[PDB]
Design a protein around this ligand. Structure first.
Ligand SMILES: *[C@@H]1O[C@H](CO)[C@@H](O[C@@H]2O[C@H](CO)[C@@H](O[C@@H]3O[C@H](CO[C@H]4O[C@H](CO)[C@@H](O)[C@H](O[C@H]5O[C@H](CO)[C@@H](O)[C@H](O)[C@@H]5O[C@H]5O[C@H](CO)[C@@H](O)[C@H](O)[C@@H]5O)[C@@H]4O)[C@@H](O)[C@H](O[C@H]4O[C@H](CO)[C@@H](O)[C@H](O)[C@@H]4O[C@H]4O[C@H](CO)[C@@H](O)[C@H](O)[C@@H]4O)[C@@H]3O)[C@H](O)[C@H]2NC(C)=O)[C@H](O)[C@H]1NC(C)=O
Ligand code: XEI
Ligand code: CA
Ligand code: CA
Ligand code: CL
Ligand code: NA
Ligand code: NA
Ligand code: ZN
Length: 802
């Protein structure tokens, strides 16, 4: 760096100048490449940040940090309280809220600017608990659009979440999978301290600033060096906003290190946390008074958003891997509020992940972490498809840390930390949107931060890069600039087979004790097989298959299915269970009954002999025989086309769900519609596998083994109306259960299923959208609700947090 060039006239330049030209962009400090006069010219502090009565009308002194001279407004460099002190104006916070129906912008503005005001570690409950000391933030919240909280991504660390905000992508896809990382392809490490993190190969997808630039929209900096004070960041944004039309950015970011920085020292609610919340509110006040001076307070859209929350965590709540593993020196641990383990040396072929996992599994009765192979982590975390995520993972209980050995912790510092499971209440953060494009005095339900990129694009008239948001699911936040998506087109149409095969054409090794015999009821069963009860069991239309495949719709009295000729089982099975439905047992005459389905060829059917031969694998049913409507309808549940491969350990889970939980939910929700099916995700990318990706078959057969089983349980949001006769909005909960040959995940699994199955299911709660990705199906195609509302419904996650 030739650092005796000047920053005069160039302070906080938007464009980067290449070596040996010295730099005056912020970031110069982060590279140690600023020109000599950077601090003198760009970080002025003289006289501080506020006008006082004596400064009003002063002669401009270019040394001052900000100005109270007559020419300051035109120049765009007044202290933010100038009109208040010197012209009798009110602070923005003291003005009444008035609806912003249209942007009220200076001539020459082509679109309302967007300012993203991001706050590190701002936990959701600060909005209520700190309300008395945050009056500017409370005005934004109550006058704008707000959610009770926003869900971060896992891990609930800073860079993964800020870069998710910027890209709309899960960490596995954007590549910033932690605050610390090793990439084995690069053979390089990423760390908070130091400068390898500024190398661009870490940062995937397309962040908002690049999306904007590529489409002709200019952007302010998103990264502020820690040594630039907050007052200067605000004044710099306000100066940029005063630029001529051809130079002025349309998108800006502010970032505060608080309240996270203090939260780590004092805990989320330590008495020392009041002051950092006050100071953040003051900074919001400075921005809003500043905008108001420039006549931009009813022109700019402001987003107030956090990256993650903060939980109580101390030194003594640390689990040590040295208390579980004798081999502790042969591993590397990425430690703290999550654990990631790999071999210390890849030339040590002694190292075995399976034995590590087993040494870490259910060893102490209140063990405060749980080991997983990354592919077995709850699918809702989307935390697996990246080479920077180690195969072995530890999910740490809230309030705890994991470390390799005690010397790492003592060689206590801190009372707060974050990083845990993104459904944990303490990790939830905030969202407020204020401006012409957001709604007025509107509360919206909680949503995930992956959704915001799309909205920021909508706010700026940009087409978003491909991302993991569901574009349109946040249309309810917006007064205008909504995105009006169309339902995806069905790719494969189904076959509707009638009766085509005689019983004796099947040689499947299956038996059913079913030989006993009317004319009223003969027409009656024909009609059920033609789909006469289908409006009862298929409430929201049939799911659309969004890929090329061969499948059949099969109708029955109690359930309807889309049966895949390729995978030899249903892609989906749909049924409604009323509040009044009863549970019956599987009779003795049918215990091992499997019956040929005369609508589907032997060639496209499973067979019982494969299951007899496969000593590890059994079978279950997608529509549960326990909930058949009548003894005669129960025969349908034993069709070979309703059978699916299940490990005996998984059958314990599944049978409990089907026999007990479904009926419980129907009683609690006033009927439920259930859609169940298999998922195949052998490469753990979160997306439906093709046939050539399947790694396990039922021994000796072409019957593929699912990695997971899903269910989507829908009812009326107004639970006074039965599921099958609902006029208004829907209510959903779903899960994606791992199809595992043991129950090692559940430490209490030797006990009765009433003590552990439900806890397992809650852990593996899912969005309907997660299931769509995993199956290539599109659900809720035929409702009376608006498509945007259905999109919101498909992104809902039932979290089971109290
Ligand atoms: C969340 O949203 C995102 C974004 O929509 C979804 O991720 C996308 O998934 C797509 C479907 O899998 C995927 O498409 C592939 O792209 C390959 C080209 O990719 C490069 O270019 C794009 C576009 O600019 C870029 O986005 C990519 O960026 C990734 O990689 C860089 C460099 O490593 C990273 O810095 C960055 O973080 C990002 O990493 C992530 O994605 C990759 C996979 O692409 C993962 O491996 C990482 O772990 C991380 O998750 C790239 O720079 C393209 O090569 C693929 O095409 C193959 O497949 C078919 C087969 O028929 C064929 O048409 C092609 O010819 C090709 O096949 C041949 O190559 C095969 C693979 O080597 C080979 O095995 C075969 O034998 C064949 O010869 C494919 O189209 C898209 O790139 C990503 N995008 C991103 C940003 O991740 C994600 O799925 C969503 N999640 C959920 C749950 O919904
Ligand atoms: C609002 C925002 C801020 C932001 O960084 C703020 C930042 C972090 C650490 C030190 N200093 C800072 O200024 C980023 C990254 C990707 C550049 C980290 C993205 C967004 C978005 N969207
Ligand atoms: Ca943070
Ligand atoms: Ca897959
Ligand atoms: Cl990390
Ligand atoms: Na078997
Ligand atoms: Na167990
Ligand atoms: Zn932190």
């Amino acid at each position: 760096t030739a650092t005796s060039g000047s920053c005069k006239g160039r302070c906080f330049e938007l464009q980067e100048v290449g070596p040996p030209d010295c730099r005056c962009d912020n970031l110069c400090k982060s590279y140690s490449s600023c020109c000599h006069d950077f601090d003198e010219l760009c970080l002025k502090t003289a006289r501080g940040w506020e006008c006082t009565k004596d400064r009003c009308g002063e002669v401009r002194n270019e040394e001052n940090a900000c100005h109270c001279s007559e020419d300051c407004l035109s120049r765009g460099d007044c202290c933010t309280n100038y009109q208040v002190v010197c012209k009798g104006e009110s602070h923005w916070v003291d003005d009444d809220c008035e609806e912003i129906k249209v942007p009220e912008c200076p001539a020459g503005f082509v679109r309302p600017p967007l300012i993203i005001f991001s706050v590190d570690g701002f936990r959701a409950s600060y909005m209520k608990k700190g309300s008395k000391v945050m009056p500017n933030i409370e005005k934004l919240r109550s006058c704008g659009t707000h959610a009770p909280y926003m869900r971060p991504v896992y891990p609930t660390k800073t860079f993964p979440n800020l870069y998710t905000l910027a890209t709309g992508l899960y960490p596995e896809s954007h590549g910033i999978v932690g605050n610390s990382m090793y990439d084995p392809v690069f053979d390089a490490s990423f760390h908070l301290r130091g400068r390898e993190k500024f190398n661009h190969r870490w940062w995937g997808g397309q962040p908002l600033w690049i999306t904007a630039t590529k489409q002709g929209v200019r952007a302010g900096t998103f990264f502020w060096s820690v040594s630039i004070p907050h007052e200067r960041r605000i004044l710099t944004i306000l100066q940029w906003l005063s630029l001529p039309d051809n130079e002025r950015p349309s998108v800006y970011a502010f970032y505060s290190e608080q309240p996270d920085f203090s939260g780590h020292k004092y805990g989320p609610f330590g008495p020392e946390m009041t002051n950092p919340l006050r100071e953040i509110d003051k900074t919001v006040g400075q921005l809003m008074d500043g905008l108001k001076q420039l006549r931009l307070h009813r022109c700019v859209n402001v987003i107030f958003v956090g990256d993650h929350g903060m939980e109580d965590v101390t030194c003594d709540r640390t689990e040590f891997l040295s208390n579980y593993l004798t081999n502790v020196d042969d591993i590397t641990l990425v430690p703290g509020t999550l654990g990631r383990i790999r071999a210390k040396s890849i030339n040590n072929s002694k190292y075995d992940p399976k034995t590590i996992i087993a040494a870490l599994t259910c060893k102490k009765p209140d063990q405060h972490f749980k080991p997983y192979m990354k592919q077995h982590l709850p699918k809702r975390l989307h935390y697996a498809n990246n080479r920077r995520i180690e195969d072995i993972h530890l999910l740490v209980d809230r309030r705890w840390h994991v470390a390799r050995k005690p010397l790492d912790v003592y060689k206590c510092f801190f009372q707060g930390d974050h990083g845990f499971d993104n459904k944990v209440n303490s990790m939830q953060t905030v969202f407020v949107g204020y401006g012409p494009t957001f709604k007025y005095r509107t509360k919206v339900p909680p949503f995930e931060n992956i959704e915001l990129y799309n909205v920021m694009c909508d706010l700026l008239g940009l087409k978003p890069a491909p991302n993991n948001g569901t574009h349109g699911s946040l249309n309810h936040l917006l007064r205008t600039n909504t995105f009006r998506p169309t339902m995806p087109d069905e790719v494969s149409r189904p076959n509707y087979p009638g009766i085509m095969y005689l019983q004796s054409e099947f040689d499947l090794g299956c038996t059913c004790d079913d030989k006993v015999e009317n004319k009223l009821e003969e027409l009656n069963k024909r009609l059920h097989t033609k789909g006469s009860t289908k409006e009862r069991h298929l409430l929201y239309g049939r799911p659309a298959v969004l890929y090329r495949t061969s499948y059949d719709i099969l109708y029955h009295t109690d359930f309807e299915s889309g049966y895949s000729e390729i995978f030899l089982m249903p892609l989906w099975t749909s049924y409604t269970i009323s509040k009044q439905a009863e549970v019956s047992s599987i009779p003795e005459h049918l215990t091992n009954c499997v019956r040929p389905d005369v609508r589907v060829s032997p060639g496209f059917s499973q067979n019982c002999l494969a299951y007899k031969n496969d000593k590890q694998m059994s079978y279950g049913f997608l529509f549960p025989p326990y909930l058949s409507s009548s003894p005669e309808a129960k025969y349908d549940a034993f069709l070979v086309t309703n059978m699916v491969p299940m490990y005996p350990a998984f059958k314990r889970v599944w049978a409990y769900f089907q026999r007990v939980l479904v009926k419980k939910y129907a009683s609690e929700r006033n009927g439920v519609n259930v859609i169940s099916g298999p998922i195949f995700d052998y490469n753990y990318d979160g997306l439906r596998d093709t046939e050539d990706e399947i790694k396990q078959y039922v021994e000796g057969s072409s019957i593929p083994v699912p990695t997971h089983y899903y269910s989507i349980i829908t009812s009326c949001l107004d639970f006074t109306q039965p599921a099958d006769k609902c006029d208004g909005p829907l209510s959903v909960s779903s899960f994606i259960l791992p199809h595992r040959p043991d129950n090692d995940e559940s430490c209490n699994s030797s006990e009765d299923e009433s003590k552990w199955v439900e806890e397992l299911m809650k852990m593996h709660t899912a969005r309907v959208r997660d299931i769509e990705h995993l199956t290539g199906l599109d659900f809720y195609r035929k409702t009376s609700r608006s498509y945007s509302e259905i999109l919101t419904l498909k992104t809902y996650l039932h979290t089971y947090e109290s």
